[PDB]
């Protein structure tokens with residue numbers, strides 16, 4: 001019986017670092033990266049995904065729908081094989097969810113006009129459908145940082161394509177993160193999700209070698225599920 | 226147990242007509258129309274407006290809309306389910322062509338073929354065919370039946386597009402040259418009927434043949 005936690009948050013808040021911290025604290029703990037993050041920097045999968053990322057960055061109003069499609073189906077399959085292959089008290093740690101795909105990223109491209117009524121309408125259906133047709137999660141852990149901490153972090157990361165991402169986007173993605181995971185205001189069609197329990201974690205301070213409290217906070221919340 | 230038979234055919238080759246014609250003949254005989262037929266209506270219209278913009282998006286909605294429709298009907302004594310085209314049609318006819326005519330790029334094309342390879346590796350689950358019936362018509366023929374059908378946005382279909390498509394049908398369903406990542410398919414028997422002659426009020430010969438074919442599977 002595998003528990004299922006999603007680790008969520010804005011660009012450069014510290015998810016993969018956190019995910020690769022818990023990684024070696026237990027062998028009942030496994031981690032599934034987010035596919036997009038491997039296409040992000042530096043095989044047929046990587047080829048395509050990196051092709052798709054650059055195009056979405058260069059002309060989002062043309063490539064948002066295809067990007068969202070490939071990136072969600074990639075997380076989906078990446079997530080399926082981690083039931084297969086590995087894991088007494090097993091937890092799987094997901095690096096973002098198919099819900100972030102949709103209520104954070106996909107949603108923001110509609111409202112910014114990068115996907116049109118048809119595009120976004122056809123995405124909501126596929127999504128609803130592809131997901132109803134094993135990965136529903138036991139909990140969500142929210143690593144909350146500011147747009148500014150987020151903005152500084154991507155600069156410390158130094159990714160080519162990401163240096164141009166401006167504070168105003170991050171500022172939109174923070175708001176949706178907030179409405180979903182803290183005031184629990186955002187409303188959806190995965191109903192269980194309205195009451196999956198969530199833990200919010202302040203990672204504005206650097207925790208790269210001072211993380212015991214955050215982890216005790218994780219261990220405690222696992223205990224409550 | 227429900228036998229699954231796809232009616233393949235170029236545009237307006239007779240497909241919708243023969244399949245309904247069939248629909249009345251037997252208790253044991255039902256049909257799943259092509260969802261693009263009823264069209265989807267914007268995505269199809271955007272498809273005719275600017276195909277190098279919408280080809281990828283349509284193909285995905287088109288094909289998944291057919292998988293849903295077919296599954297739905299996947300739930301008589303000697304059951305036979307007839308489909309109107311199929312997910313091989315969607316990939317080796319249409320997406321293939323559309324990649325071939327640069328309305329999709331390699332990324333697009335690779336990303337489609339992977340998603341089709343996967344959307345249907347969980348879903349051969351009675352969408353896998355028992356036979357194919359190829360309504361072979363000449364392109365010339367199909368071009369008149371499009372004026373026959375007298376359909377708005379379908380009026381300007383060239384002469385040459387319809388050519389592209391039949392050469393692809395014939396390589397797939399008559400010469401059997403064409404190769405795919407469903408090894409089963411190359412097994413599967415095909416039946417090949419000529420439909421240039423009208424048949425609305427003269428189909429017994431046709432249906433007789435259908436009947437021999439089903440009888441041997």
Ligand SMILES: O=c1ccn([C@@H]2O[C@H](COP(=O)(O)OP(=O)(O)O)[C@@H](O)[C@H]2O)c(=O)[nH]1
Pocket residue numbers: 009010011012013014015016017018153154156157205206207208
């Ligand atoms: O406590 C931390 C967490 C991370 N980072 C740095 O911020 C950048 C982005 O973090 P990460 O890739 O883990 O963020 P994610 O997008 O996965 O949330 C990397 O250079 C990290 O080393 C940091 O300076 N202090």
Ligand SMILES: O=c1ccn([C@@H]2O[C@H](COP(=O)(O)OP(=O)(O)O)[C@@H](O)[C@H]2O)c(=O)[nH]1
Pocket residue numbers: 234235236237238239240241242243370371373374375420422423424425
């Ligand atoms: O023997 C026939 C077969 C078809 N049609 C007509 O050809 C047009 C297109 O037929 P259908 O929708 O069956 O073509 P499909 O696209 O479904 O192959 C319609 O007006 C049919 O009435 C016809 O006149 N004689």
Ligand SMILES: Nc1ncnc2c1ncn2[C@H]1C[C@H](O)[C@@H](CO)O1
Pocket residue numbers: 011036037040068071072100101105106162165
């Ligand atoms: N669904 C998605 N998942 C992950 N990233 C997304 C997604 N949509 C857009 N992006 C943008 C954020 C970064 O610029 C870049 C790398 O994450 O892609």
Ligand SMILES: Nc1ncnc2c1ncn2[C@H]1C[C@H](O)[C@@H](CO)O1
Pocket residue numbers: 236259261262284287288314315319320379
């Ligand atoms: N998968 C598909 N199924 C049926 N039609 C397709 C498909 N892809 C493109 N087309 C084009 C042909 C017609 O002009 C128009 C209506 O059939 O759509």
